[PDB]
Write a protein that binds this ligand. Sequence first.
Ligand SMILES: O=C(O)C[C@H](NC(=O)CP(=O)(O)O)C(=O)O
Ligand SMILES: O=C(O)C[C@H](NC(=O)CP(=O)(O)O)C(=O)O
Ligand SMILES: O=C(O)C[C@H](NC(=O)CP(=O)(O)O)C(=O)O
Ligand SMILES: [Zn+2]
Ligand SMILES: [Zn+2]
Lengths: 310, 310, 310, 153, 153
Amino acid sequence: ANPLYQKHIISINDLSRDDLNLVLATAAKLKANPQPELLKHKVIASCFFEASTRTRLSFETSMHRLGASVVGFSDSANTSLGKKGETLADTISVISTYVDAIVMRHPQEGAARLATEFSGNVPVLNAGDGSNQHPTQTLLDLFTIQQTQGRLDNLHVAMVGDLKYGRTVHSLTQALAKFDGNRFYFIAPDALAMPEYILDMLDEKGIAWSLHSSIEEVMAEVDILYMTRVQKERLDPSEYANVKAQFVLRASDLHNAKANMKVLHPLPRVDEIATDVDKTPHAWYFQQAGNGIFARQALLALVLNRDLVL
Amino acid sequence: ANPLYQKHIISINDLSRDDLNLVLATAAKLKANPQPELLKHKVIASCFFEASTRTRLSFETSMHRLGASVVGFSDSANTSLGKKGETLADTISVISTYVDAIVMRHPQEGAARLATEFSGNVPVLNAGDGSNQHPTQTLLDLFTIQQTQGRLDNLHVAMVGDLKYGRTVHSLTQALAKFDGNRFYFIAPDALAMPEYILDMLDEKGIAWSLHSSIEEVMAEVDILYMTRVQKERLDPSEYANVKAQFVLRASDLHNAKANMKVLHPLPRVDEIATDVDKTPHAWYFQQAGNGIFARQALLALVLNRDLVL
Amino acid sequence: ANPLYQKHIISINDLSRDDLNLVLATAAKLKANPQPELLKHKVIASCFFEASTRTRLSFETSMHRLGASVVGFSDSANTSLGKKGETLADTISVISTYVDAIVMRHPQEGAARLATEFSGNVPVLNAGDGSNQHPTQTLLDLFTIQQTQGRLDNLHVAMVGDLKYGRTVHSLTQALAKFDGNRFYFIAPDALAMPEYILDMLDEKGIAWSLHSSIEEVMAEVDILYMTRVQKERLDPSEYANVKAQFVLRASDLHNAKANMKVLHPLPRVDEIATDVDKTPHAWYFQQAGNGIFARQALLALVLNRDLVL
Amino acid sequence: MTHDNKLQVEAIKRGTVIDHIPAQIGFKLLSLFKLTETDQRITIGLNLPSGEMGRKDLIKIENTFLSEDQVDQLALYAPQATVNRIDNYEVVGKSRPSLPERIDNVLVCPNSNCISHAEPVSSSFAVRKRANDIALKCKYCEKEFSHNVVLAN
Amino acid sequence: MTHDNKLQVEAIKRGTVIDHIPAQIGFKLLSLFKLTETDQRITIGLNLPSGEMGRKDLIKIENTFLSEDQVDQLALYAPQATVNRIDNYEVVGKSRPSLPERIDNVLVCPNSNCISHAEPVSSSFAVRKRANDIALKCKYCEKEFSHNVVLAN
Ligand SMILES: O=C(O)C[C@H](NC(=O)CP(=O)(O)O)C(=O)O
Ligand SMILES: O=C(O)C[C@H](NC(=O)CP(=O)(O)O)C(=O)O
Ligand SMILES: O=C(O)C[C@H](NC(=O)CP(=O)(O)O)C(=O)O
Ligand SMILES: [Zn+2]
Ligand SMILES: [Zn+2]
């Protein structure tokens, strides 16, 4: 039994530093030593109650790359919860009698935690629940930073955009606070700032963070600049002032940047990253997405395989 | 490396006579010598941004008949391009880091060509882009004409219906102009006529074509009568006069027809072919659809297999 | 032929202290001694393309109270302009060939101005155009203000609300800067502040004005507290943050209030003036409204009648 | 009697000669005031040196005659500029765009809810010397905008 | 080397000199070639005559020589143009515009349903002389239009 065996992956806050390390290490192995039938005979429900291109297709692709079968729904509209009034509790209850793991993405914060109280032995994997967490994104981002920085400590990381509704940054900050010496620069409209709950943890850990009103102020320092999309779908109408990207990244502002720096982004990008950045050796968002394949395979292996040997 | 290996299938105009021949020949082989694991271990994205019954399910069925796994979306509504504003360029960019081929059908002319500039080594297969092309339809139609006429030369072919918005006929005319001695009769409302770009090519090749205002005038001559559905979804509102089938085929008008003639149709038919034609030894539209299985298997084999031996 | 005879009443910036004093004295004489046939045989168009309860109704009662007749609309949905695509220009062109005057309210700024260039001889009264002017509101506010303070010169005036889109404050502020010694206080969210053009006209004129963050910060030095509604229907989406009133007048705020201070408001109010205020002695909005009859009968009397009412 | 420094032919019978237009204006004036929509001989010299007026710009329109009305309308872009009236080769007149009190049919009211955008009327603005810049006020909506922000055609 | 034929002529050491620009076309190239940007003593002559040919437009930009494509792109807008490379008050090379095989970026596909509009890509058509008019084929939608229509971008 590996530490991750049959564990629910709901919140980075429930995961430890060595847990995250076993994933990155396994990811690395699969990425060079493909295990085509590691999951032969399993059937995973890929249940997404909210839109997805990357998350769902990477997950489904990983399952297939490992021999799993997949069954599920990409829209809640044609489910019985959609047209018949079924609770989410009962939906998870019956589905868990069919399959081996459940990858779920939902619009309301806490939809994943609630799934666990209703699924028995079936591990639940959080592909995103509202603006709360998205641990799998964070596993693929950590893998992407590791492989380009050769480290997960003492890094200088800037997080730009919607930090408030961004479950991507909520989960990545809690992960990167688990390693040592990392420094954080948060650049976001005041309305969409970093929640206090995460800052307080930082203080409580004695992590060095700070605020800035422009990328220009930090460009020369960061090793990683995590650009984020404004969560239009979640904004309360009073926040409607904040729909257009306040901070936009053009190829020219990467001029004083460290040679080793990589621009990451969870994607989809709208206008926060002008397309001319794409051709700079700094843009790493598409390599970061392909990484979704290797990190999520690793997770399915670790969670459904009592003992992995590669 | 067969000629088709890793090639994008975007437009019949980019394909040659021997290319089309290798497909028909391979089709024929698979249709009698099933290769159950020819594609074991591949994962193909079946991305349809527009409605489909035949094309999508035949494609997906072929992939499975060959051991491939499939991952994808039958509606763009629940994608990130659907609800998050993602460009089609970025959608193709990330998806191509997951899979081996991408079968895509889209509403706008040129959506497939654009996919190639964004997918690297990943071959793109055009399941239809607006009213422009649909090469796979044409491969299954050529297979259907070959197997019933025993030839692809000197045939007399009538094309009836919406010739203007019909990507089906645009691609089939360019294919059948690549063989010798074929003669073309075009029967269509003036508003929905055969584009000039295709006629000019015909002239330029010295192909014999002509126009007629009724099936009655040509019934006794054609070997193949390709009936087409009026593209209601594409009609500009000024063309709204042309929504009802101007030319309808009833079982009685097949009376003076050559014994060897077969009625083909891409389908779905609405009212252009009365259902009593279904029982005549002339109707060949359902046998033509099943043919989708064998021609598209052939294509996936030829494109993903460096060297095929059957 | 009195100064305003056959004149167009489009903006308070085209009138002068004398013109205004002309209207209020007439207002006064009319209130004391009604003239039931003073407009016998005139037919007036009441054309409202935006909503209205007091402007339209007080306007129409006024025409009737003076013997005139009325033709019009209260919604352009069933006008040729609304269902057949007509221009406002043509609309006023045909209308000015039936009636003696056009009283109109419109959703776009400068629509009353436009109509003057096409109404020929018929005068155009502006019952409000978008967020520009509302001159007849201004007339009754002046009349009510003089009624309750004895004068219009040297008054302490606080304007609270949506000062940016309030067409009422634009006019009124311009009207009082035509008198001597008036002092201004402005309390509004920063997004709905008095427009520049008004603050400038003030400076040029040496009028004293200052911003404030609380009604209470002026409660003691004011004679007239002019309350306004957040012109909700005019806000841009990016201003949806100020859709709910920030300054609400409740009775207990009228504690240090000057003995002669009245609360005015052009109505309709939503949450900015609590109902308890209604029964204190400072509330004068419903009397202010009722005074609309007189400012309006007087204006009509003057524009359509040659000699100073005898 | 233009100047000297290596020859080329360049003198006209009658017409107009807007002299002393600063850089990146000349093009703008040809486009806005449509001073190119005519069969007349036009000679636009750009960047051609003129001392204090280091990189001046110049335009010459044959037969064409400006109007006090027109000329003034240039003070919104090239005010210092001098209009030289050349008739029968003799420079007969010489103005300098001063400020007009109203700009018509050229600009476009930045207020998107302005009636001018829908109806078939001609835009029109009152010009005013605000403080630093010139203040433009729409005839219809009554809003005033930095003479710099008001766009045109 | 010499002095030109017709009257009002302008001179230069090194630079490009485009002549024969049909009437009313000179100002436009000045727009869609972004020539006016370069502060190099540009000279322009709208409506000059053109002997038996009529009236002509012409541009002179010192120190500036056209792109490795602009002449080809200048072929569609004004086929009968002449591009003179003038080095040291002399023509060390004269060219005629040739219509290229294909044209990129500058053109906008007239088919509204073409994906080139919506997506971040460069337009590019394939030029093919047809019967008198030239035909352009969109790289993306595969349609071929007459340049009459395409030149409504
Ligand atoms: O939505 C974002 O931009 C960030 C993040 N994006 C993703 O997970 C990528 P995707 O939506 O396609 O699956 C998410 O939280 O959904
Ligand atoms: O739509 C048509 O009738 C012709 C043609 N039909 C098909 O491809 C069959 P289907 O839509 O089910 O996949 C097409 O171009 O979509
Ligand atoms: O609507 C307001 O808040 C103030 C003002 N109100 C009025 O004129 C009263 P009503 O719209 O009922 O005629 C206006 O601008 O319309
Ligand atoms: Zn305006
Ligand atoms: Zn196109």
